[PDB]
Ligand SMILES: C[C@@H](O[C@H]1O[C@H](CO)[C@@H](O)[C@H](O)[C@@H]1O)[C@H](N)C(=O)O
Ligand SMILES: [Cl-]
């Protein structure tokens with residue numbers, strides 16, 4: 523078994539979402555995070571050349587970061603209360619892609635199995651991001 527799951531980080535509000543089928547389009551190539559004053563509003567992840575369907579609300583500013591070719595996320599940390607507040611994506615190229623506000627319950631996600639990276643994300647959303655889950659695989 524190479525696959526592993528980190529989470530669920532957050533509360534049980536909003537509605538379930540999963541990017542489980544999105545991993546077929548390719549590896550994670552870019553990240554979109556909408557963030558307001560306190561919370562993380564929305565999430566959107568680019569798998570290969572295809573962007574996922576947007577999950578979350580509209581009340582916030584969009585932040586977009588493209589990843590280098592062959593660069594994959596190897597650690598995910600962040601903070602939350604009832605809703606997700608912070609996200610930091612650590613890549614194998616030694617980059618720390620930080621989004622959101624530095625306040626709340628901390629978490630630090632690492633892959634359980636050898637040589638595995640972040641392949642897709644899941645969680646709960648509504649008008650904000652209620653919870654996030656990290657899925658690791660080869
Ligand atoms: C307060 C908020 O409610 C929506 O968004 C939250 C956070 O994403 C969810 O927990 C709720 O289930 C709901 O979808 C809106 N401002 C609202 O009043 O609808
Ligand atoms: Cl699960």
Ligand SMILES: [Cl-]
Nearest residue numbers: 571572573574
């Ligand atoms: Cl697209």
